[PDB]
Structure formats: structure tokens, C-alpha cells
């Protein structure tokens, strides 16, 4: 599963975020086409150059997150649809990140920010009208990890591009509480890269017991958030059979002495109908102990 740590389309400007070049540069934008205000950030300083426009997000609380994923939705103009972009117009923005144990805010230090990668649009917004009549939503995704401090910062550096940032999502993966194999495996966190991450063992469901000469149930949670490779299992105890993913008592006339998930075995020859949930079959009146030796 995914546990969201930051969404831009939840509050107005996520109700935060800093613009380093003071008022000029990045400016939070918004449109009210409907009764659902849609906040967004933008910068369109193409015809100037020497641009150091920044946008820093608010301190996100790391929690149990170990690898964070970043999903940006944006559009970019042509760098060519504006006559006058002479050797001052670029079409890429650089994505940064900084790791901190304490929220600082409004003290963005250009220095202390490590870069992930320079993103670029896969579709260019071209239009005749200056207002750019329609839209082309680019969708690209990066991840950075492992994270160490109690939180982090995201950054968006611009060198004079006309970009339209529409959303920013930051999430981490989590393995979602499987219950198969008569064992209840709890939900666990994802790993950093190529890990065997925390092969969380299972919890035997009702009336399920690990075989004496058998390995304990264990499943390997992975970086993507997917469970993997079941090792071991729980088995329905004596007197119980595997009905769906829970051990159920043997129906009247059935027994399950062999402690296993195998269905209820039928009462052998010449034996009184064993009651519900029976273990080894009680012999029959006059019959003494598999068929009760006649």
C-alpha cells in the first residue's frame, strides 16, 4: 500500500511553501473554474536569464518512512512560442532535497540542498493564445533514499523556464497485511533499494498450528510494498479443516486427527458418527481400536 506524506492538492498552496527570490520568481497561482479552488505554483521568467528561482516545501515529518517517492504533475511551455527567448530560455527544472531533524522554515540556505535529478517534460505546452488555452499534463516520478533524519525538505530550482506545477505527492510503500496461508502477517514498511526487507513472520489464525517438524510462516516484504515468497505456513490443528482462510471444526460425522489443513476425513468403518470438530474417532459401541477392529 501507499501512505501519503504530502499532497499539494489538499490545501491552498498546501497552506505553505517558500519562494526564495522574495516576491519575484515563483508565485503561487490558482483558478476557480468551479466551486473547487485549484492551487498551483508557476514561474515564467524566460526573457531574462540569470535566474535562480526557488520553491521550498514545508518540513514533512518522516515518521517510519524509509524510501519516499515523488510524483510531480506539471506542464511546460515551448521556450519557442515566446519570441525573445534569445539564449535565456530553458525547459528543465532541477529537483532537490534536504534532510533535517528539525523544521526551520523561511531560512532556506541555497547551500544545504542535495539534488536528485533534473526533470524535464515529455509533452510541451504549445498554443497560439498567450493564455495557453488547453493543457498537457506531464507525469514523472523519482525516489530518494534511505532517509535518516526526523524529516526532510523538497526544493524546486528554476533557471528561467515557463513551467506550471500542478501537484506534488510524496509517499512511501508498505506491505498490506496479508492473511493467506492460515497465518495473519501484519502490515510492514518498504525498504530502500534491492532489499530482503524485514521478512515479517505470520500469526497462526484460529485453530491453526505450525507443524511440529516444520518451519514457521514467514513472508518477505519488499521495496515496492509487495509481499513475496511465502516461507513456512500455519496448518489447521487436529479436529479442524481449512474452510476459506480460517480453521473450521469438522462437521458431525467427520474427524481430523491428523493436524493439517487437509479437509475432514470421513469416519472409518463400523464407528459411531463422531461429533462436530472431532479428533481421532471415538470407537463405536462394542467396537475397539482406522476401522475399529471388529
Amino acid at each position, epitope marked *: 500500500k501507499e501512505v501519503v506524506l504530502l499532497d499539494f492538492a489538499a490545501a491552498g498552496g498546501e497552506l505553505g511553501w517558500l519562494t526564495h527570490p522574495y516576491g519575484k520568481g515563483w*508565485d503561487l*497561482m490558482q*483558478n*476557480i*473554474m468551479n466551486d473547487m479552488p485549484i492551487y*498551483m505554483y508557476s514561474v515564467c521568467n524566460v526573457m531574462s536569464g540569470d535566474q535562480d528561482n526557488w520553491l521550498r516545501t514545508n518540513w514533512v515529518y518522516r515518521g517510519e518512512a524509509e524510501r519516499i517517492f515523488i510524483e510531480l504533475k506539471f506542464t511546460v511551455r515551448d521556450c519557442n512560442s515566446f519570441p525573445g527567448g534569445a539564449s535565456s530560455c530553458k525547459e528543465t527544472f532541477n529537483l532537490y532535497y534536504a534532510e533535517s531533524d528539525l523544521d526551520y522554515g523561511t531560512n532556506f540556505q541555497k547551500r544545504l540542498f542535495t539534488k536528485i535529478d533534473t526533470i524535464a517534460p515529455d509533452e510541451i505546452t504549445v498554443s497560439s493564445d498567450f493564455e495557453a488555452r488547453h493543457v498537457k499534463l506531464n507525469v514523472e516520478e523519482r525516489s530518494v533514499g534511505p532517509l535518516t533524519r526526523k524529516g526532510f525538505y523538497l526544493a524546486f530550482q528554476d533557471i528561467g523556464a515557463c513551467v506550471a506545477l500542478l501537484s506534488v505527492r510524496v509517499y512511501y510503500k508498505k506491505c498490506p497485511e496479508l492473511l493467506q496461508g492460515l497465518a495473519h502477517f501484519p502490515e510492514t514498511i518498504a525498504g530502500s533499494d534491492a532489499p530482503s526487507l524485514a521478512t515479517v513472520a505470520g500469526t497462526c489464525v484460529d485453530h491453526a498450528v505450525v507443524p511440529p517438524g516444520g518451519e514457521e510462516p514467514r513472508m518477505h516484504c519488499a521495496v515496492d510494498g509487495e509481499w513475496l515468497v511465502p516461507i513456512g505456513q500455519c496448518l489447521c490443528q487436529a479436529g479442524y479443516e481449512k474452510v476459506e482462510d480460517a480453521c473450521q471444526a469438522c462437521s458431525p460425522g467427520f474427524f481430523k486427527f491428523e493436524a493439517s489443513e487437509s479437509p475432514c476425513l470421513e469416519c472409518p468403518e463400523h464407528t459411531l458418527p463422531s461429533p462436530e470438530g472431532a479428533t481421532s474417532c471415538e470407537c463405536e459401541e462394542g467396537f475397539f481400536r482406522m476401522p475399529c477392529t471388529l
Partner: antibody
Amino acid sequence: EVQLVESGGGLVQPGGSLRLSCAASGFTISSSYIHWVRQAPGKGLEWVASISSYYGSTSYADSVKGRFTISADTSKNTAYLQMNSLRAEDTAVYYCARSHYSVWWGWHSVSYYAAFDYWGQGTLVTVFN
Amino acid sequence: IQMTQSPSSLSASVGDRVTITCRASQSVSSAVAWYQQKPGKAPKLLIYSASSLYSGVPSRFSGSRSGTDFTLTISSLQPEDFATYYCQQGSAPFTFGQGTKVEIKR
């Protein structure tokens, strides 16, 4: 502080040429558009032209399309409108104003949007003989 | 897009609630503004963004709207105002409203 002044009015012959100038004060025309709005005698307001001195994008109404031209000498914070082939209909009082650019359709500058906040005073271009 | 107004003109007494609607025939975004131009005087901004009151403008002016029924409203009346009131669409055309002649009674 943010002041707009218009000059260049008078009487010109039918089909003549006049030049109107809007002098901008207290702000940089690079961070805003420049508009020209005329008011015919007894009628409402009509938008004429727009310019984007930082970007250079222009726009005109079909009433004056081709005949009227808007310019911006970005070195002196001044916008101009050169009217040619003045018609008897074109006689009006021409105002100049400003507004933010907001390059994305329907998106407007939450921090710096104030639709036509500052205005000029009015200059008369009599087109008669 | 064709901005239209109604009523063309009106007269009312002091202390009267008044309303004039700018019918946005087509979906010209939603950013609109309302102004008021003194006959033979430079206009001043009244309200913009269809809700954002120009700083210092009296509180009676209000940006009400119902779909494409962008409209202005005044609580009762105070010393200033009483002109022909114009609207304007904030979209690219910037086509200002055709006006509505208001009149103080006596």
C-alpha cells in the same frame, strides 16, 4: 505611488494619425500588462489593445484591428498607441491601465492580481473637420 | 463570449438594497470584476476576483454570483457612489460591462 498619465489628445482630420502616450509611475510595466480602454460619448467602455512589454505579446479588438498599434518603450516605462485612419466612430476618451499577466488560462496571480486596479484620467481624441 | 447587463438603468431611495447582474453568456473563466464610472471622471476599482473587495472600498459592495450570474450588491447607501456601474470579465477579452445607470432618490 502607482500613477498613470495620458497625453496626446487633440483634434485630427478624418483619416489622420494621432499618437497617445501613457506614462507609468510607481511600478515597472514589465511585471504587468498595459491596456487601452476608450469611452464613446454617452456609451459604455470598450477595450482596445493590450501589450506584454516583458514578453511582447499583443492583442487588439476587431473594432481597431490592424488600424491601431500598441507599443511599449520598456526603457522609459511608457506605452503608446498609434491610431491611423481615425474614423468618426473612433472619437472617444482613451484611458490606460494595468493588470497582471498570469500566463496560464484562467489562473490569476493570488498575490498580485487586482483587475485594472490603477487607472489614468482620460484624454480626448476629437476626430472631426 | 458576450457579456450582457440588466437592468439598463434604475432609480432607488437611500437605504435600499440594490443588485445588478452581468450575464456571462459563455464560460469566460470565472474571474470577473465590477466597477463604476462617474460620468466625466476617471474610473476606480470597486471589486475584483468576483469576491475580492478592493482595499478601502466600503463594505457594502459584495461579489455575489450564481453560475454565470456574476453580480454586485450594495447594503443600503452612503455619501459616495451613485454612478453608471460597469462589470468586467477577467479573462483574456477584458470586455467591460455595458453599464447600469443608478440614481439616488430625493
